[PDB]
C-alpha cells in the first residue's frame, strides 16, 4: 500500500514530467490538510466503539427484519460478526483518511471482499447502509469537535460503497 | 448430448462388441421406465411456470437477495434469475427423459460456475433454489418420479458447487 | 552433517491476545548446523533463553566431510 | 437414438416436448423388447451372415482387394462386415440411424478412399450382407435391418 | 478498482454443535471410521432421543406459562404477555393455490438479589418490552433446541458476549427472569430426576455463559508488515468445528505417538501415503522422534526435505504452485499477499526446495502456531479470523483437489488484484474459444481448472484487434488493423442474377462449386464431408438461380442440422452463442449487452431465432450486406499473439570513439 | 457438516417457532432408526476391506480398465482406485450416521468432478463400482440397512 | 504472410536501408530455387491423395489408434485425421513455394497443439504421421526437393511438440 | 482401555469430557464384573485352550515349525499361544485392544519374520485358539473376546 506522498513521488518519475507545477500544487494542497487528517483519525480512534455501536443500532432500526428470525443479524453470533466487520470498515477508513490514498482500502479491505460476502451470504445493501451510517456519525462527531473543512472524510466511506455495491443503472 | 441407449451403445462400441447381457438388462430397465418418464415430462411441462413460481417463493422471496442491493433486486435481475431457473427445470426434464445427465453437463454446467462468479451471482443461494425446485417437483409429481427428477436436480446442484 | 543439541525455553509473548492453547516451551532437540543460526535468532527475537548448546554431531574445525 | 433426436428438436425451439413428440417417445419405448430381440438375432447370426455374404460377394465381384491373396486384407474386410452388422444392430436398438451414421457413415467415403477400397465393391458387399441378414429373419423384423443396410449403401454410393 | 475475483466457494459454517455432528467431525478430520467409543456415544445419544423429544415437547407445550413466570418476576405495572409476538405463518404466497385465477376477493369468506428493582412496563416502552418478551421466548426456544441437539453449544455460542448487547442495566433482571423460568420448567417434571437434571444443567449453562462480561476477541496478529491483523469473536470459534490437535510427548505410549505421527503424515502429505510409496526411511525418522532426539518441528522439516515430498508436491508442479502448496503443508494456510509469495519465490530461487522448507518451518509463525510438539493442523474458516484477499484461493487450497490444479491460484489473483479488467470474455476465460480456422475449442472448467472470473458489468466493451480484411470500398475507416493469416481483399461476393439458355462457358471470379465451398468453409470453418451437403442441395440451387441472396444462403447454412450438431447441440449455451457470433459476424461479441440480448433470445425462442437475430442485425447488413460471405474482421489479443510466434526481426540489438585516450588517469608518471 | 437434527432445528429456527409435531416426528424416526444405523456402521467398519474387494471383483476386475492402457493399470492407480472406493464407503457411513447428505456434498462431491476430469478417471466405471459396493453392502447388512445406506450411495453416484 | 522476398524486404526495412549484398545474394538464391520449388509443388499437387494414403498406411494403420477405442476409430474421426493430414500437406506445399514458414505459423500451427490436447488427439502419433509424410514426399520428389519440403514438415512437427 | 481413549479424545479438543463420554465411561465401569469374570475363565482354561488349539492347528497345518520334531520349538509355540491368550484377557479387562496392541501386536510381523515363523501358520493357530476359546463361554461373553482374536489375526496379515 501507498500513501499520497509516495504515490505522487513515484508518479513523478513514471510520467516523465518530474516535479512540475501541477505536482507541486497538488502536494501543497495535500500537505495543507495533513493536520486535519491526523485530527480526524484521532477522533475516529478515540470513539470507534461508540461509532460502530450507534451505526449498527441505527442499521437494525432501519432494517428490523435483520434481527428477526431468518435475518442475517439473527443470534448473537451474527450480531458480533456485524460489529466486528463494521469495526474493520471504520479502521481501514481511518487508515485511508490518514494516508490520503485509497490503496490501503484496495489492498486490505476490498480485495476479495465480494467473494467472501457471496460465499457467506452477507447482504451488500445493509453493508453499504452501515458504512454510510458510520460516515454520518463520524461527520457529526467531527462537527462537534469543531472541524470545518472535512470534505475528505467523505472520500473513503463513499468510495468503499461504490466498490461493494452492485450496478443498478 | 447422450441418453441411456446411446450411453450403453457407446460403452459397447469402445470395446468393439455387441451389447452384453448386463447392458441389455439396463436397456430393458430404461425401456420399462420410459412410460413413467413420459408421464413426469408431461406433468412438468404442464406446470413449468408454476413450479418456478413456487421455487422462487420457497427459496428466494422475502430474503436479503430480493431486498434493495441484493442480487435479485431490480426487475431485470429478478427476471434473469427466473430465466435461469426455467433453464434448469427444462434441462432437468430433458435429462430425466433421456435417462442420462450428459446433456446437463454439456449444456448447463460447463462454465456456469465461472459465469456466476464473474456476475456475482450467489452460488449457495442458487443451489438452495435448485433444491427447493426439487422439493416442489417431488410434491407436484410424486415420490418415485420426484426422486427420479431429483437425481438430475442433485446433479445440477453438485455441478454448481 | 553437523548437529547441535540445543536446550531452550521459549515462552509465548502473545498467548493472551490470540488465546492459543498452552504449549510446553522448554525443549531439548537436535538442530542441523545449517538451521541453527536462524533458529537461535528466532528464539532470541521471541524473548526465549538458550540454556545449553552442544555440538552433538561433527567435529570442530573440520575443513571437509561436512556432508 | 430417437430420444436424443426428440430432445434436441425440442431444445432447438427452447420448449418442452410437444404432445406429438411425447407420443413418439411412448411408442418407441413401447417397442423396446422387439428391438432387443432383433439386436440379439443380429448378434447371434453375425458370423454366418458375414461368411455367406463374403462368399456371395466374392462370387459376384472377384476383382476386389479382399480376395487378392492378401490374408490381412481378407481379415480386414471380414471385420468391416462384422462392424457394419454391429452398427446396424446398434441402430435397431436406438430406434434411429444415428448410431450407424455417427460411427460408420459420416466420412465413410473419405476413409475408404484413403484406404483405396473401391466404393462400388463395398456397396455390393453390403447388398450381399443385407440379403443374408434378411434371409435369417421375419420380414416385419427385417424392415429396419433392410432400411439401415440401404442407408449404408446410399452413404457409400 | 478491484475487479479481479478469486471465486466464491460454497461454504456452510457451523452455527452450533450436535452430538452426531461433533462425533462424525472428529472422526472425519482423522481420516478413519468411527471408533468403538464414538459409536457407543452415538448409540447412547440415539437411544435417549425419545426422552429428549418428550422433554422438549413438554417445555414447548408450556412455553407461554414458563415465559409468563419469567416475565412476572421482573415486570410490574402492566401485562408483559401483551408484548409477546408469536411467529406469523406466511399464507397466500405466490403459486400456493390460495387464490384461483385472478380472483382475490372470494378467497376470504428463589430469593431476589439484594436491592433488586423491578421494571415498570409503562415507562420501559413498547420497543424494549417487545425486545424483552421476545428474548425470554427465544431463550426458552433455544433451550429446547439444545435439549434436542444433545449439546448446549447453541446456547453457549449465543449467550457468551450477550451481556452488554442486552443492556447492562437489566442484566441482573435477565438472570432473575431466567431463574424464574427455570423454576417453572422444573415444576413440569417433578417426577424424573433425570429430565430435571438435564433442564437444570441447560439453564445453569445458559446463566453461567450469559454472565461472562465482554469476552475478549481472539486476535490474529499479522506475521509481517505485508499482512493485516484481524479479530474473531469467541462465539464464532465456539460454534465452529473443533480441530483435533495432537501434541507429541516423549512420555506417551507408543500407540499415542504413532497416532501423532500419522497426523503429521496426514497433514504434510495431505494423506498417509507413507506405506503406499514405500517410505522406508520414515522408520529412522520415527525413531528420532520417538526417542526424543528431534521434535515435531524437526520431523516436519525432514519430511519436507524428503524424496517423498519432492515426488508428491514438487515434481508435478511449477515453482509457483509448489510454493502455494507448501504454504498449506507447512503452515496450515494459504499465502496471504504477493509480497509473501515474492519472498518465498526468492528463497526457492536462491536455495531450492530445501531452502523453501526451511523458510516455512523456521518462520516465527510456525513456532507461534505449532511450537515444537504440536502437530501442524489446518487453520482457516472458524479457527481464526480470515482475510478476504485470499478467501477463494485458500478455500480451494484446503480441498483435497488442490494438488490436481497445476495453474497457480494465488500469485495470479494477487497480480490481477492490482490490474484493470482483463482481456477476456465477460463470462470468464472459459468463454473464449481458440481463434483457429474451425472447431469450437474452449477451456473446460473441470479439466485443468484455471478460471479467473472478473467483475464485468453490463456496459463493458471489449477491445478487439481489427484484421484489416474486406473489400477496398468497405475500408479506410478501420484500415489501420492488420492481423497475420488474414485474406485481405479475398472476400467471397456474388452479384445477384438478373428466355434463352446460357453459354457453355461463363466465368465469374469463383466458379459456382468454388463459391459454395467457400461459403461452407466460412460458415462451418471447414469443408463438410461427402454426403453432409445433401440436406442443403435445394438451398444451393436457389442460390445459383438467384432465388435467394448470399445472406439467405448463409442463414440457411447456419440453420441446418449439421451446424446445430457441430456448434449448438453439445456446447454450453453462451459458449455456443459466442462461437456462432464469431463465425457469422466475423468478430467476438463486445460485452454483456450483446451477450445478454442473444442469451435472452436463446432462452425465449431458441437456436433458430438466435441465427435470425445475428443475420438480421444491422451490423451484418453494414459489413456483409446481401451478397458477401462473412469473414473474420476482429481477433482478440491472445488470438493475435498466437499467430505471431516469430520475433527475430525485433531483436536487432542495441564506431568512432567519443574520447581520446580512454580509460586513463590524469598526470600519470 | 450437518446432521438431521441440525437441519430440523434450522428449519424451525428460520421461522422462529418451536419444534412442530412434524419435525418432532422426523426427529423421532431418526432417533429410532439410530440403533440399526449404528449397528450397520459397526458391520461396515468391520467388513470394509471385504466390501471393497468384492466390489472390485464384480465390477472392475478382468475388464479393459485393468489391462495396460486402462486407468486402473499399474499398481499405483489400482491402489488409488481402491482408496477411492474406501473413501466412498467411509463417507457413505458418515452420511448414514448423520442422517444427512451434507457431509457428502462438503467433502466428496466438492471437487470430485474436477479431480476425475483432470486426472482422466472414467466416471462411468466409478459409478458402476459404487453400484456394486451398494449391492455388496445391502447383501451384508440386510435389507433396510442396505437401503438406507444405498440412499447415500446413490447420492454419491448422482453427484458424479 | 511472408515469403522469402518479403522476409528479406522486411529485414532490410526495419533497418531503413536497401537490400545489402548479402540480402541480394539470398534473393538470387531464392530466384534460382524457384524452378525446383514450382516442380515440387506440381508433383505434390498431383500426388496429394496417395501421399496421404501412404502416410496413413505406414504410420497409423493396424495400430491401436484405428482399433475400437482409438482416436481414429469410427469413420468420422478417421476422416478428420485424413483431413488434418491433407491440411498439413497443402500448407507445407504453400510454405515450400513461398520459401517461408510464416503461413504455417499463422494458418496451421496457431493453437494446434492446444486444440489436440483439448480433443485428446495423440500428439506423438501426429508427429509420427508428419514424419511418415515427409518420408513419402521425399520418395516422391527426390532428395533435394524432399529435404526442402522436409524443412516445413519438420517445422510442423516441432510446432506440434 | 476405554477410559484412556475417552480421556485422550477429550484432551485432543482441550475440553472437559462431554456428557456422552461420561455416559460411555459409566456404562463401561458397570460391566467390570463381567469383564473380570471373563478374564478369570480365560485364565483358568488357558491350558486346555492351548492344548486343543495346538492339536487342531497341527491337524490342519502339519508343516509348521512347532510340528517339526523339535521339543523347544513346540514348547515356545505353546508358550506364545498362552501369552496371546493372556493378552486377550488383558484386552477384555481394559475394554479395548490397547493392551494387546501395545504388548504383542505392534511389531509382531517383524518379530516373527526375524524368528522365521510363517505368519499364515500363526494366523491359523490364532483361528484355532479363537474357536477353542469361544466354545468355553457364553455367546454374550464371546462378543468382546472373538473381536480381540480377530485383532491378532488382522495385525498378523
Ligand atoms: C402493488 C402496487 C401491487 C401488488 C404488489 C405485490 N408485491 C408483492 C411482492 C413483491 N414485489 C416485488 C417488487 C419489486 N422487486 C424489485 O426489485 C422491484 C424494482 C425496484 C420491484 C417493484 C418483489 C420482489 C416481491 C416479492 C417479495 C419480496 O419483496 O421479496 C406481492 C406479493 C406478496 C406475497 O408474498 O404474496 C404483491 C401482492 N399487489 C397488488 O394488488 C398491486 C397491484
Ligand atoms: C436465480 C436462481 C439466481 C440468480 C441468477 C441470475 N443470473 C443472471 C444472469 C445470467 N445467468 C447466466 C447463466 C447461464 N448461462 C448459460 O449458458 C446457462 C445455461 C443455459 C446459464 C444458466 C447468464 C449467461 C447470465 C447473463 C448475464 C447478463 O446480464 O449478461 C442474473 C443477472 C445478473 C446481472 O448482473 O444482471 C441473475 C440475478 N441470481 C440470484 O441471486 C439467484 C439465486
Ligand atoms: C470388405 C467388406 C471390403 C474391404 C475392406 C478393407 N478394409 C481394410 C482396412 C480397414 N478398414 C477399416 C474400417 C473401419 N474403421 C472404422 O473406424 C470403421 C467404422 C466402425 C470401419 C468400417 C480400417 C480402419 C482399416 C485400416 C486397417 C485397420 O485394421 O485399422 C482393408 C485393408 C486395407 C489395406 O490397405 O490393407 C480392406 C481390404 N475390401 C474390399 O474389397 C471389401 C469391399
Ligand atoms: C501511440 C500513442 C502509441 C502507439 C499505438 C499503436 N496502437 C496500435 C494499434 C491498436 N491500438 C488499439 C487500441 C484501441 N482500440 C480500441 O478500440 C480502444 C478503445 C477505444 C483502444 C485503446 C488497438 C485495438 C490496436 C490494434 C489494431 C487496430 O487498430 O485494430 C498500433 C499499431 C499496431 C500494429 O502494428 O498492429 C500502434 C503503433 N504506438 C506507439 O509507439 C505509440 C507510443
Ligand atoms: C502370480 C505370481 C501370483 C498370483 C497372481 C494373481 N493375480 C491375479 C489378478 C490380478 N493381477 C493383477 C496384477 C497387476 N496389475 C497391475 O497393474 C500390475 C503392474 C504391472 C500387476 C502386477 C491384477 C490387476 C489382477 C486383477 C485381475 C485382472 O488382471 O483384471 C490373480 C487372480 C485374482 C482373482 O481373484 O481373480 C492371481 C491369482 N497369485 C499367486 O498366488 C501368485 C503368487
Ligand atoms: C476407482 C473406483 C476408479 C479410479 C480411481 C482413481 N483415483 C485416482 C486419484 C485420486 N482420487 C482422488 C479422490 C479422492 N481423494 C479424497 O480424499 C476424496 C474424498 C475423501 C476423494 C474422492 C484423488 C484426490 C486423487 C488424486 C491423488 C491420488 O493419486 O491419490 C487415481 C489415480 C490417478 C492418477 O493417474 O494419478 C485413480 C486410478 N480409477 C479407475 O479407473 C476406477 C474406476
Ligand atoms: C490425424 C493425423 C490424427 C488425428 C486427428 C484428428 N483431428 C480431429 C479433429 C480436429 N482437428 C482439428 C484441427 C485443426 N483445426 C484447425 O483450425 C486446423 C488448421 C486448419 C487444424 C489442423 C480440430 C479443430 C478438430 C476438432 C473437430 C473438427 O473437425 O472441427 C479428430 C476427431 C476427434 C473428435 O473427437 O472429433 C481426429 C481423430 N487423430 C489421430 O489419432 C491422428 C494421429
Ligand atoms: C478487512 C477486510 C475483511 C472483511 C470485511 C472480512 C469479513 C468477514 N466477515 C465474516 C463474517 C460475517 N460477517 C457478517 C455480517 C456482516 N458483515 C458486514 O460487513 C456487514 C456490516 C454485515 C452484514 C450486513 C456475518 C453475519 C458473518 C458471519 C457469517 C456466518 O454466519 O458464518 C467473515 C468470516 C468469518 C471470519 O473468518 O472472520 C469474514 C472473513 N474479513 C476481512 O478480512
Q: Rounded CA gap, F54 and F45, in Å?
A: 15
Element (H, E) at E119: strand E119-120
- Compute the distance between CA of residue A36 and CA of residue A98 in angstroms, rounded to an integer: 9
Short-list E314, E304, E299, E315, CA closest to E262: E299
Strand partners, E220: E230
Residue A2 to residues B6, D6, D36, E411, G35: CA-CA distances in angstroms?
Answer: 61, 62, 74, 20, 67
**Angle CA(F52)–CA(F58)–CA(F60) in degrees, nearest 5?**
80
Taking the CA of residue G3 as centre, how many other CA atoms within 13 Å lie in the half-sphere pointing to its CB?
11
- The secondary structure of residue H101, as a DSSP letter, is I
- List helix spans (H) across C1-67: 15-18, 33-45
Note which residues in 55-94 of chain G have CB less than 8 A from chain B: 67-69
- The three-state secondary structure class of C66 is coil
Map residue D81 onto helix, strand or coil: helix
CB contacts, 8 Å: E372 with chain C? 23-24, 27, 29
Contact E389 A112 (CB under 8 A): yes
Q: ∠ at Cα E336 (E331, E341), nearest 5°?
A: 85
Sheet holding C3-9, edge to edge: C26-32, C3-9, C49-57
Does ligand 8 come within 6 angstroms of the Cβ of E355? no
Q: How far apart are CA H95 and CA E35, in angstroms?
A: 13
Residue C30, SS3?
strand
Q: Using CB atoms within 10 A of its CB, is residue B40 exposed (0-12), middle (13-18) or buried (19+)?
A: buried
**Contact call for residues H130 and H146 (beta carbons, < 8 A):** yes
> From the DSSP assignment, how many helices (H) and strands (E) are in chain F?
7, 0
Q: What is the 8-class DSSP label of residue C6?
A: E
Backbone φ and ψ for E26, nearest 5 degrees, come out as -60, -40
Rounded to whole angstroms, how far apart are CA atoms G27 and G34? Answer: 10
E493 forms bridges with which residues in the sheet?
A: E628
CA E325 to chain centre: 18
Q: How far apart are CA E594 and CA E582, in angstroms?
A: 12
Other residues' Cβ atoms within 10 Å of the Cβ of residue F80: 16
H125, H34 Cβ separation under 8 angstroms: no
What's the maximum distance between 2 C-alpha atoms anywhere in chain B? Answer: 60
Closest CA to E453 of B65, A161, B120: B120
Please name which of E291, E345, E347 lies closest in space to residue E321, comparing C-alpha atoms.
Answer: E345
The burial class, CB within 10 Å (0-12 / 13-18 / 19+), for E110 is exposed
Task: For residue E532, count CB atoms less than 10 angstroms from its CB and return exposed for 0-12, middle for 13-18, buried for 19 or more.
Answer: middle
Of E9, E233, E391, the CB nearest to A81: E233
Say how many CB pairs under 8 Å bridge E and G. 51
Distance CA(C54)–CA(G99), nearest Å, equals 74
CA distances from E94 to B140, B160, E101 (A): 15, 27, 12
Number of CB atoms found within 10 A of residue A162's CB: 10
The C-alpha atoms of residue B35 and residue B20 are separated, in whole angstroms, by 24
Concatenated DSSP letters of E159-222: HTTTBTTB-TTSHHHHHHHHHHHHHHHHTTTSS-SSHHHHHHHHHHHHHHHHT--SPPPEEE--
The reply to whether residue D103 touches residue G82, judged by beta carbons under 8 angstroms, is no
CA of G59 to the centre of ligand 7 (A): 16
Neighbours of A33 (CB within 10 A): 15
What is the DSSP-derived secondary structure letter of residue E549? -
D17, D25 in Cβ contact below 8 A?
Answer: yes
CB contact D105 to G (< 8 Å) = yes
Give the whole-angstrom CA distance, residue E117 versus residue E111.
13
- Residue E2: closest CA among F119, A159, A74, A49: A159
By DSSP bridging, strand E119-120 and strand E75-76 are parallel
For residue F62 and ligand 5, the question of a CB distance below 6 A is answered with yes
Q: Which residues of E touch G (CB under 8 A)?
A: 434-437, 439, 441-442, 444, 484-485, 526-527, 529, 639, 642-646, 649-650, 652
**Is E513 a pocket residue for ligand 1 (Cβ < 6 Å)?**
no
Quote the CA–CA distance of E189 and E174 in Å, as a whole number: 24
CA-based max dimension of chain C: 48
CA angle E404, E410, E414 (to 5 degrees): 155
Q: What are phi and psi of G66, to 5 degrees?
A: -90, -10
CA angle at B52 for the pair B47 and B58, rounded to the nearest 5°: 120
Report which DSSP code applies to F68. T
* Buried/exposed E166-185: b ≥16 CB within 10 Å, e otherwise: beeebbebbbbbbbbbbebb
Between the CA of residue D21 and those of B137, C46, E247, E603, what are the distances in Å?
Answer: 22, 77, 67, 20
**Which residue does chain A place closest to E215, by CA atoms?**
A80
- Report d(CA G89, CA G155) in Å as an integer: 12
Following DSSP, what letter does each residue of D13-73 receive, concatenated?
TTSPPPHHHHHHHHHHHHTHHHHHHHHHHHHHTHHHHHHHHHHHHHHH--SSSTTSS-HHH
D chain contacts of residue G80, beta-carbon cutoff 8 Å: 107
Q: Is E128 left (phi over 0), alpha (psi -120 to 50) or beta?
A: alpha
A115 contacts on B by Cβ (under 8 Å) = 117
Residue-by-residue DSSP string for G25-85: HHHHHHHHHHHHHHHHHHHHHHHHHHHHHHHHHHHTTTSTTTSTTSTT-SHHHHHHHHHHH
- G40/G140 Cα distance (integer angstroms): 9
For A5: left if phi > 0, alpha if psi spans -120 to 50, otherwise beta; the answer is alpha
Whether the CA torsion G60, G63, G66, G72 is positive or negative: it is: negative
By the CB < 8 Å criterion, does A70 face chain F? yes
Resolution rounded to one decimal, in angstroms: 2.5
Residues written for chain B: 161
CB-based contact F118 E149, cutoff 8 Å: no
Distance of residue B101 Cα from the nearest chain F Cα, in angstroms? 9
Distances (CA, A) of H25 to C23, E40, H20: 28, 10, 9
What are the chain H neighbours of E26 within 8 Å (beta carbons)? Answer: 9, 13
Specify the residue with its C-alpha closest to ligand 7, atom 28. Answer: E439
- The span from the CA of B120 to the CA of E5, in Å, is 9
| C-beta separation of C18 from E219 below 8 A | yes
Chain A CB contacts of E386 under 8 Å are: 116
In a 10 Å sphere around its CB, with 0-12 CB exposed, 13-18 middle and 19+ buried, how is residue E78 labelled? Answer: middle
Look at residues E14, H34, F56, E421 and name the one whose alpha carbon lies nearest to residue B118. E421
Contact E372, C29 (CB under 8 A): yes
Residue E219 — φ and ψ, nearest 5°?
-90, 135
Cα separation, G133 vs G157, whole angstroms: 11
Backbone phi, psi, residue E519, to 5°: -65, -45
E314-320, long-range: CB within 8 Å, 24+ apart, which pairs?
E314/E353, E316/E403, E316/E406, E317/E403, E317/E406, E318/E406, E318/E408, E319/E345, E319/E348, E319/E349, E320/E345, E320/E408, E320/E410, E320/E411
* Strand-pair partners of C50: C8
In chain C, which residue's Cα lies nearest the Cα of E292? C29
Phi, psi of F99 (to 5 degrees): 65, 20
Q: Which of E480, E485, E486, E649 to mutate to test the pocket of ligand 4 (most atoms within 8 A of CB)?
A: E480
Q: How far is G106 from chain B (nearest CA, A)?
A: 29
Distance of CA D22 to the CA centre of its chain: 27
Amino acid at each position: 500500500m501507498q500513501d499520497k506522498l509516495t504515490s505522487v513521488a513515484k508518479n513523478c518519475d513514471l510520467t516523465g514530467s518530474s516535479l512540475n507545477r501541477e505536482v507541486v500544487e497538488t502536494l501543497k494542497e495535500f500537505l495543507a490538510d495533513g493536520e486535519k487528517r491526523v485530527q480526524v483519525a484521532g477522533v475516529i480512534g478515540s470513539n470507534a466503539a461508540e461509532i460502530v455501536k450507534t451505526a449498527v443500532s441505527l442499521l437494525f432500526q432501519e432494517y428490523p427484519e435483520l434481527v428477526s428470525p431468518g435475518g442475517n443479524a439473527y443470534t448473537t453470533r451474527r450480531y458480533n460478526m456485524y460489529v466486528r466487520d463494521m469495526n474493520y470498515f471504520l479502521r481501514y477508513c481511518s487508515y485511508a483518511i490518514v494516508a490520503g490514498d485509497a490503496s490501503v482500502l484496495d489492498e486490505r479491505l476490498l480485495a476479495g471482499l465480494r467473494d467472501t460476502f457471496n460465499s457467506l451470504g452477507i447482504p451488500l445493501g445493509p453493508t453499504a447502509r452501515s458504512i454510510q451510517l458510520m460516515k454520518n456519525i463520524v461527520k457529526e462527531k467531527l462537527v462537534t469537535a469543531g472541524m470545518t473543512n472535512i470534505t475528505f472524510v467523505d472520500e473513503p466511506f463513499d468510495y468503499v460503497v461504490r466498490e461493494i455495491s452492485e450496478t443498478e443503472i | 448430448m447422450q441418453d441411456a441407449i446411446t450411453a450403453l451403445i457407446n460403452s459397447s462400441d469402445v470395446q468393439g462388441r455387441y451389447l452384453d447381457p448386463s447392458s441389455l438388462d439396463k436397456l430393458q430397465n430404461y425401456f420399462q421406465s420410459g412410460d413413467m418418464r413420459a408421464k413426469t415430462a408431461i406433468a412438468v411441462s404442464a406446470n413449468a411456470k408454476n413450479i418456478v413460481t413456487k421455487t422462487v417463493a420457497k427459496s428466494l422471496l422475502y430474503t436479503d437477495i430480493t431486498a434493495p442491493g441484493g442480487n435479485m433486486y431490480t426487475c431485470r435481475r429478478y427476471a434473469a434469475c427466473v430465466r435461469d431457473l426455467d433453464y434448469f427445470l427444462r434441462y432437468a426434464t430433458y435429462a430425466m427423459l433421456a435417462g442420462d445427465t450428459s446433456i446437463l453437463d454439456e449444456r448447463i454446467l460447463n462454465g456456469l460456475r465461472e459465469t456466476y462468479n464473474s456476475l456475482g451471482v450467489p452460488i449457495g443461494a442458487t443451489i438452495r433454489s435448485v433444491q427447493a425446485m426439487k422439493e416442489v417437483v417431488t410434491s407436484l409429481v410424486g415420490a418415485d418420479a420426484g426422486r427420479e427428477m431429483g437425481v438430475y436436480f442433485d446433479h445440477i446442484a453438485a455441478g454448481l458447487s | 552433517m553437523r548437529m547441535f543439541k540445543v536446550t531452550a525455553c521459549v515462552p509465548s509473548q502473545t498467548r493472551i491476545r490470540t488465546q492459543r492453547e498452552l504449549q510446553n516451551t522448554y525443549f531439548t532437540k537436535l538442530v542441523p548446523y545449517d538451521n541453527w543460526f536462524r533458529e537461535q535468532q528466532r528464539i532470541m527475537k521471541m524473548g526465549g533463553k538458550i540454556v545449553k548448546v552442544q555440538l552433538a554431531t561433527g567435529k570442530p574445525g573440520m575443513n571437509t566431510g561436512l556432508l | 437414438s430417437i430420444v436424443t433426436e426428440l430432445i434436441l428438436n425440442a431444445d432447438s425451439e427452447s420448449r418442452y416436448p410437444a404432445p406429438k413428440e411425447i407420443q413418439v417417445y411412448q411408442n418407441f419405448v413401447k417397442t423396446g423388447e422387439q428391438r432387443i430381440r432383433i439386436a440379439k438375432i443380429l448378434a447371434e447370426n453375425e458370423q454366418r451372415i458375414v461368411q455367406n455374404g463374403s462368399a456371395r460377394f466374392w462370387e459376384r465381384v472377384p476383382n476386389t482387394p479382399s480376395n487378392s491373396g492378401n490374408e490381412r486384407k481378407t481379415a480386414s474386410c471380414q471385420r468391416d462386415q462384422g462392424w457394419y452388422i454391429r452398427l446396424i444392430a446398434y441402430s435397431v436398438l436406438a430406434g434411429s440411424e444415428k448410431p450407424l451414421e455417427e460411427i460408420g457413415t459420416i466420412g465413410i467415403k473419405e476413409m475408404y478412399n484413403n484406404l483405396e477400397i473401391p466404393l462400388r465393391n463395398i456397396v455390393e458387399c453390403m447388398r450381399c450382407l443385407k440379403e443374408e441378414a434378411l434371409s435369417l429373419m421375419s420380414e416385419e423384423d427385417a424392415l429396419e435391418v433392410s432400411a439401415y443396410f440401404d442407408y449404408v449403401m446410399r452413404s457409400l454410393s | 478498482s478491484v475487479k479481479a475475483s478469486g471465486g466464491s466457494p460454497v461454504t456452510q459454517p457451523q452455527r452450533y454443535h450436535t452430538v452426531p455432528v461433533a462425533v462424525i467431525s472428529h472422526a472425519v478430520q482423522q481420516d478413519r471410521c468411527l471408533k468403538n467409543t464414538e459409536l457407543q456415544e452415538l448409540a447412547d445419544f440415539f437411544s435417549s432421543g425419545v426422552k429428549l423429544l418428550e422433554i422438549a415437547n413438554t417445555l414447548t407445550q408450556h412455553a407461554d406459562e414458563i415465559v409468563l413466570a419469567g416475565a412476572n418476576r421482573i415486570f410490574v405495572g402492566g401485562s408483559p404477555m401483551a408484548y409477546l409476538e408469536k411467529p406469523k405463518e406466511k399464507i397466500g404466497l405466490p403459486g400456493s393455490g390460495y387464490y384461483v385465477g385472478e380472483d382475490f376477493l372470494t378467497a376470504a369468506r428463589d430469593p431476589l438479589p439484594g436491592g433488586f428493582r423491578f421494571i415498570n412496563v409503562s415507562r420501559y416502552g413498547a420497543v424494549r418490552m417487545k425486545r424483552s418478551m421476545r428474548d425470554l421466548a427465544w431463550f426458552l426456544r433455544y433451550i429446547t433446541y439444545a435439549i434436542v441437539a444433545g449439546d448446549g453449544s447453541i446456547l453457549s455460542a449465543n449467550v457468551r458476549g450477550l451481556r452488554g448487547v442486552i443492556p447492562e442495566d437489566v442484566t441482573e433482571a435477565t438472570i432473575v427472569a431466567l431463574r424464574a423460568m427455570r423454576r417453572q420448567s422444573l415444576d413440569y417434571f417433578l417426577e424424573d430426576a433425570e429430565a430435571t437434571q438435564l433442564v437444570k444443567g441447560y439453564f445453569d449453562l445458559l446463566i453461567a455463559e450469559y454472565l461472562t462480561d465482554k469476552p475478549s476477541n481472539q486476535v490474529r496478529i499479522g506475521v509481517s508488515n505485508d499482512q493485516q491483523g484481524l479479530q474473531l469473536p469467541q462465539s464464532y470459534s465456539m460454534s465452529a468445528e473443533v480441530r483435533p490437535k495432537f501434541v507429541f510427548k516423549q512420555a506417551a505410549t507408543l500407540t499415542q505417538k504413532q497416532e501423532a505421527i500419522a497426523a503429521i503424515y496426514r497433514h504434510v502429505f495431505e494423506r498417509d501415503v507413507t506405506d503406499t510409496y514405500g517410505f522406508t526411511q520414515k522408520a529412522e525418522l520415527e525413531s528420532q522422534l520417538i526417542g526424543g532426539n528431534i521434535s515435531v518441528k524437526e520431523f516436519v522439516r525432514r519430511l519436507g526435505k524428503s524424496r517423498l515430498y519432492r515426488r508428491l508436491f514438487y515434481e508435478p508442479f511449477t515453482i509457483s504452485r509448489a510454493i502455494e502448496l507448501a504454504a498449506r503443508h507447512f503452515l496450515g494456510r494459504g499465502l496471504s499477499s504477493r509480497e509473501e509469495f515474492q519472498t518465498y519465490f526468492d528463497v526457492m530461487t536462491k536455495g531450492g526446495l530445501p531452502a523453501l522448507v526451511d523458510a516455512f518451518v523456521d518462520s516465527a509463525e510456525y513456532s507461534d502456531y505449532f511450537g515444537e510438539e504440536t502437530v501442524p493442523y489446518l487453520r482457516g474458516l472458524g479457527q481464526e479470523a480470515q482475510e478476504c484477499r485470499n478467501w477463494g484461493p485458500q478455500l480451494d487450497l484446503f480441498k483435497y483437489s488442490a494438488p490436481v490444479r497445476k495453474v497457480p491460484q494465488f500469485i495470479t489473483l494477487f497480480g490481477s488484484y492490482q490490474k484493470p479488467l482483463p482481456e477476456q470474455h465477460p463470462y470468464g476465460c472459459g468463454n473464449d474459444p481458440l481463434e483457429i480456422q474451425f472447431g469450437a475449442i474452449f477451456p473446460q472448467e473441470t479439466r485443468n481448472p484455471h478460471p479467473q472470473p472478473a467483475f464485468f458489468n453490463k456496459d463493458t466493451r471489449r477491445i478487439l484487434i481489427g484484421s484489416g480484411a474486406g473489400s477496398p470500398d468497405k475500408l479506410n475507416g478501420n484500415a489501420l488493423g492488420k492481423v497475420p493469416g488474414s485474406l485481405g481483399t479475398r472476400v467471397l461476393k456474388l452479384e445477384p442474377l438478373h428466355g434463352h439458355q446460357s453459354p457453355s462457358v461463363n466465368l465469374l471470379h469463383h466458379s459456382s462449386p468454388a463459391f459454395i465451398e467457400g461459403a461452407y468453409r466460412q460458415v462451418f470453418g471447414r469443408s463438410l464431408y461427402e454426403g453432409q451437403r445433401q440436406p442443403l442441395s435445394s438451398t444451393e440451387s436457389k442460390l445459383l438461380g438467384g432465388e435467394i441472396s448470399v445472406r439467405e444462403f448463409v442463414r440457411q447454412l447456419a440453420k441446418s442440422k449439421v451446424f446445430r450438431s457441430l456448434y449448438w447441440d453439445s456446447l454450453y449455451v453462451t459458449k455456443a452463442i459466442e462461437y456462432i457470433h464469431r463465425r457469422l459476424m466475423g468478430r467476438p461479441t463486445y460485452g454483456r449487452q450483446e451477450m445478454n440480448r442473444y442469451y435472452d433470445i436463446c432462452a425465449t425462442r431458441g437456436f433458430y431465432a438466435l441465427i435470425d437475430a445475428i443475420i438480421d442485425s444491422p451490423e451484418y447488413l453494414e459489413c456483409f450486406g446481401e451478397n458477401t460471405v462473412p469473414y473474420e474482421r476482429y481477433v482478440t489479443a491472445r488470438g493475435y499473439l498466437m499467430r505471431s510466434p516469430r520475433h527475430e526481426n525485433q531483436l536487432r540489438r542495441e564506431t568512432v570513439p567519443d574520447k581520446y585516450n580512454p580509460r586513463k588517469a590524469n598526470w600519470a608518471a
